[PDB]
Design a protein around this ligand. Structure first.
Ligand code: LMN
Ligand code: LMN
Ligand code: LMN
Ligand code: LMN
Ligand code: LMN
Ligand code: LMN
Lengths: 424, 424, 424
């Protein structure tokens, strides 16, 4: 590896081999991914059975492209596995459980600079620019009519292809033409001619991706969402909430740990806002039905459709007892919210006034939505991303170019990084 | 509010509007309260159907008095809601979740002194005297024959009407005649002529209140206590335990929070005292029945009323497994008790010797009783309070007067407070 | 002050009015400064008494220029005094003792951003670039032949006139042409044509400044350095040591406090390196002379030029006792050095190996020199600065330009600051 001369991509591959947990796990996951896609395709073309033949040929050609890419990438995985076993001296059996600090320790042992912070800046060199574009509103992801900021996975794929393939070298570093203030008019017009091409390609590949996605999600979740409604209120952070919470140089797996360790706190928080005027009503109704049931039971022990009424009242009382919280339950929304914020690290300025508020809870529930709503939006966004790539993104092209010139700072030994990554 | 000149009652109304959680919640609770009373009355007069007409007229006249009082009080609630929205700038939607410290912050912003501690001393000016009368034995609430200290809700209503209406101004402050040591013989005899009148009124309104209370509690709890015995061992603090734990100037909702946050610790503590000589016996019996069942099952797999015996033994073994605790369970009564005391703040002097003891647990279970026992005593105390108001309270009248003269201290900017409130 | 539009210079004037401690103290100091200069001139032209008339006319013309400038600047001082009394509400009697945090508090009360850190970045906007040029070797201040880094006060005056008058606006901010990478060849050649002009002016004003300086220092220090040699070993930090210790955005008076609070630690540290092979010799010599003196005193009490020998031996023994340290004295150079570094905040990388070392002490004594050596070098540097401005500075001109383009970062609300000021 002494002849890399492309240290950024090498470190990124080291990291994605770590988070993939070795060649075995990576190959297994990719295999089951293409198997799931192919099963969806085959089962959908079976239960429904010219135009059908042509669209099936299209789908299977995409599947074969995926397969061919995976087969092409296998050798790079082997090179990295060899680098892990031999150079890093990390056992193939230690992969699913070794930490990133241990890999960093071995990597510093093996060998301008390779500090932990430097390696984080080199792995996340483009992700930091993405965090800074999204969080600072440099790029407008708000729909023109629906008035909503949506960040699907196709949105960020298109952002990474239009911008970060155009702004960064093949060697993976900010091109020279993006700090020259005189070229700000040529680049800011060769960038709209990329947004337009990506919008054209998405207007062709977005229907046949949203269709596959809705079919896959239906097949996967129909069983649970019609035979287990308890798992219908499972809440998760929206994909835009996961880029609002992200910090700079915070590698993906650290972020995943500290976000998964926050769902307990968030589920607790969103429950600290009961409806007392409704709890009181249901307490009253439970009292009435309990009086009726007491009379009925005390009269049936002396005269053995009163059983229908007894069953109905038992059902209604069991319904009511679920709404009525425990007596010895202390509701404290502000400390629940602070317990959440110790994980999400995200407290807007105007929260600090009223963290007990209900408006704060409305906002946090805009960030922490239902999983089914997240699915509906991850399907509608694949359709509405061409709207962005045609109407809101070109108008924001100039700014983007300027953002890469103003807010780029040279950190010695790393290179040109985002200027926001060096503050926080 | 610049023309109040009755700051104590104004602050008390601010506080009870806070703890009632706004005009909406207060009105809803009062409405469902009169609805529950009226439903009990109507259903009891229905399932049972002169004397009946007369007693029904009496009950409905009391109900109408309650209704008329609530309708009379509504305008004061509106005045306070206006003061909350306009002057305090607390949103009507922030009421169920705003804290008392936020209300104090707004109230100090708006405007002798209005510190947090001063407002607590003005809201709890009579409650501090009550805590000091009850905890220091100035007033004797021990029954003459049953030899038990009972503090029902009617007991404290009678104490607040006999004493605190006679001792405190209409403006809500210690009358002047109660610090003059020469009038200690006139006041200590105009106070027995109040205990006697209250005893006479209670000997008339105590039967028709205990009757309503037992009917209400029967209707409410018969369903749960005959169809869910698991909620028969629900333990709660007796009303006298809640005045023993109360601290001075600790507003009601803080006390409620720290008492509700103690039921987990108390339930844990009362379980750290198993019967080892009984656990051993049930372990032996489970072993015997398991041997029998093993033989029976191993003999029925070769010869398919042995099923009756198998079912009976399964039932008995399931019974036995519930008593036998887990093996890896560590019983530690002293640290459980300390975990409780960190909430109740109540450790008598003689506990500090043996907090591992069983006598300490007997006392704490006198404080932390069963809810059904609490109901039986809250019904028997409504009957036995005239005994107090006739025989034990007059004999303790003199002391009471002296208590208000000796143990009153003038805190500057607040007024005459209890001398115990300023120590702890 | 709402119409300033030159916030940087306004804040710098606020700060220099604070550190000057009011109009009274500023005027008094300037007055005694011109009085000291004029006294030196008059006394030197008196004790020595064409060429004399001409050089005296030159000196007095410089004095009159200084006087005229002070008289010109008085009105700005009055404007700032009014701003301090009226707007800031800081009493004229509170000036010599008010802190900078109190001035910051008042200034934030009065009114893109005016945080403490922002005001520090605006006051020290050019000083941060100076710290970064000097500490990072962007500019070469090492003499070509003597091989020594000298930073006189004239050196930094010339740096501030050649560079910071050319690089920064009249409004006080980095000119636009210094971030355009295409103009790096025009600016890097209009900067050598400034170093050359400054070298020419210094080759004319350096003799008649070094002469005045040596005369002033002779007059001031001859008395103390010939009639009090105890104040000849007074050590101070060299002017280059005071730019090596300086941190970014550390205002001048904070730096002065933490450097003055370090001279005790430095004086302690430089004494932890005694010469044991010399202490032993002087102990032996003191023993010999004490034996001789004991014999002489015990023989003169029986036979009253032995007195000459007794006096000489007393003198030599008094000399020896000064070198020999106390017995109960514990020498610990490493913790003395750490006590120093807690103030200077300056520990090179190669110190961390051997902080007990003698080479570390040699380096620290290169930083912490004798005051008389500092005077000799502050006089020789005024002569040798044209050498820098002619031979070492032009060769380093290009780099300087690049330094202002590479290492400039835009902090929002402040402006273009040095990129090193935002790290540490
Ligand atoms: C005719 C078929 C049409 C569509 C086919 C299927 C859709 C496309 C799938 C392909 C592909 C993009 C890349 C292709 C690049 C190959 C080059 C192509 C040829 C170029 C010549 C999907 O990538 C995205 O697909 C999205 C759906 O399309 C998913 O959205 C979801 O929607 C809802 C669903 O439940 C969800 O609720 C919602 O939460 C999602 O937002 C995303 O989750 C996913 O990231 C695969 O790449 C990626 O897949 C993901 C796991 O998916 C892998 O994540 C992790 O990997 C390990 C960490 O390294 C971890 O250890 C591992 O734990 C983890 O899995 C990635 O590593 C990577 O492998
Ligand atoms: C009709 C056939 C359907 C075919 C659909 C397209 C098939 C091609 C997909 C291939 C392709 C898009 C590229 C070409 C797209 C051109 C326009 C596409 C328009 C559609 C016509 C998607 O593939 C990527 O998708 C990403 C999203 O899941 C995954 O990131 C996961 O996220 C976490 C989840 O939370 C997981 O936890 C984590 O383990 C994964 O990292 C990747 O693992 C995956 O490889 C590969 O490019 C990718 O390069 C890299 C940056 O160089 C970017 O990957 C990530 O970005 C950050 C995000 O988080 C991550 O921080 C960072 O880790 C990573 O850098 C992507 O931006 C993407 O650009
Ligand atoms: C012909 C009918 C005969 C009897 C009728 C019903 C009995 C009397 C009910 C009337 C009334 C006294 C005041 C009357 C003043 C009006 C003036 C009258 C006209 C004057 C011209 C009951 O007051 C007491 O009644 C006792 C029973 O009698 C209860 O004992 C119980 O027994 C067992 C039961 O389950 C229990 O197990 C046991 O734990 C109890 O000890 C007590 O809990 C209760 O305090 C109503 O006042 C009070 O009610 C209570 C909630 O009850 C309100 O508490 C809170 O309010 C909010 C904080 O501000 C909170 O936010 C809210 O959460 C909370 O609710 C108070 O605010 C206040 O409203
Ligand atoms: C045949 C028809 C049946 C009619 C029965 C009587 C109907 C009249 C009841 C009306 C009346 C009694 C007054 C007249 C009684 C005369 C003799 C009665 C003999 C019966 C013939 C009861 O009404 C009160 O009862 C209290 C008890 O629940 C409630 O306090 C709740 O406690 C917590 C629970 O734990 C809750 O959490 C909390 O939210 C509530 O505060 C009050 O909310 C309620 O208003 C109103 O007067 C009341 O004034 C105030 C102090 O000026 C006192 O209230 C409280 O005291 C402290 C205790 O804790 C509290 O610290 C303090 O907050 C408050 O100051 C009472 O002492 C009482 O005197
Ligand atoms: C024909 C005569 C030839 C020469 C004349 C005399 C030499 C020049 C003197 C003028 C002048 C430069 C500025 C002129 C600007 C006016 C505009 C001109 C007209 C433009 C149209 C000297 O400035 C420098 O002069 C150097 C010598 O030249 C000194 O070097 C010394 O050498 C050895 C000596 O002992 C030393 O050992 C060695 O340690 C030094 O390095 C430096 O100490 C001094 O900084 C005055 O400016 C500055 O003086 C200094 C105190 O001097 C003031 O420092 C502080 O002020 C307060 C904090 O705000 C503090 O509260 C106050 O405590 C403190 O005092 C500054 O505020 C400022 O006022
Ligand atoms: C034949 C007649 C002799 C006439 C000789 C020249 C007379 C002119 C002198 C006037 C002039 C030089 C300007 C023109 C020079 C052109 C070329 C000169 C060639 C000579 C032919 C010197 O005047 C300054 O000299 C400084 C040095 O003492 C003083 O700083 C003191 O340092 C501490 C000590 O340790 C004291 O503690 C502290 O209180 C003082 O701040 C200043 O107080 C003083 O005003 C005024 O310009 C000045 O502007 C400012 C930055 O805008 C700079 O001041 C400081 O720089 C940092 C340093 O530390 C400081 O951090 C910072 O506080 C301040 O910003 C200077 O760089 C200088 O440029």
């Amino acid at each position: 590896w002494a002849n890399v001369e492309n240290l950024d991509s090498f470190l990124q591959q080291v990291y994605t081999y770590y988070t993939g947990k070795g060649l075995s796990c990576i190959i297994v996951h990719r295999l089951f991914q293409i198997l799931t896609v192919s099963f969806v395709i085959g089962f959908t073309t079976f239960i429904t059975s010219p135009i059908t033949y042509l669209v099936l040929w299209l789908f299977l050609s995409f599947l074969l492209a995926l397969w061919i890419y995976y087969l092409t990438d296998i050798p790079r995985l082997w090179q990295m596995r060899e680098f892990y076993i031999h150079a890093l001296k990390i056992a193939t059996a230690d992969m699913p459980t070794v930490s990133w600090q241990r890999v960093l320790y071995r990597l510093l042992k093996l060998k301008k600079r390779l500090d932990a912070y430097a390696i984080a800046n080199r792995i996340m060199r483009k992700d930091n620019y993405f965090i800074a574009l999204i969080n600072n509103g440099i790029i407008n992801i708000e729909l023109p009519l629906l008035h909503r900021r949506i960040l699907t996975h196709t949105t960020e794929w298109n952002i990474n292809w239009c911008i970060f393939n155009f702004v960064f070298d093949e060697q993976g570093q900010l091109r020279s033409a993006f700090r020259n203030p005189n070229s700000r008019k040529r680049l800011s017009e060769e960038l709209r001619r990329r947004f337009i091409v990506a919008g054209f390609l998405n207007c062709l590949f977005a229907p046949i991706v949203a269709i596959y996605l809705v079919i896959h999600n239906f097949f996967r979740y129909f069983n649970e969402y019609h035979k287990n409604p308890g798992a219908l209120s499972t809440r998760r952070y929206t994909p835009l909430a996961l880029w609002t919470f992200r910090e700079y140089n915070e590698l993906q797996h650290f972020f995943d740990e500290r976000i998964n360790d926050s769902y307990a706190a968030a589920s607790h928080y969103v429950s600290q806002f009961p409806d007392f005027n409704m709890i009181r009503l249901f307490k009253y109704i439970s009292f009435i039905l309990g009086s009726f049931t007491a009379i009925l039971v005390i009269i049936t022990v002396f005269d053995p459709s009163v059983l229908f009424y007894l069953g109905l009242f038992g059902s209604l009382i069991a319904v009511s007892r679920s709404i009525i919280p425990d007596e010895t339950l202390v509701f404290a929304p502000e400390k629940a919210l602070r317990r959440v914020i110790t994980f999400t690290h995200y407290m807007p300025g105007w929260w600090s006034d009223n963290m007990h508020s209900k408006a704060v809870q409305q906002e946090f529930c805009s960030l922490y939505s239902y999983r089914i709503v997240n699915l509906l939006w991850e399907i509608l966004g694949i359709l509405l991303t061409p709207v962005l790539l045609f109407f809101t993104f070109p108008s924001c092209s100039q700014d983007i170019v300027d953002f890469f010139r103003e807010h780029t700072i040279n950190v010695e030994g790393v290179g040109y990084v985002c200027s926001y990554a060096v503050f926080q």
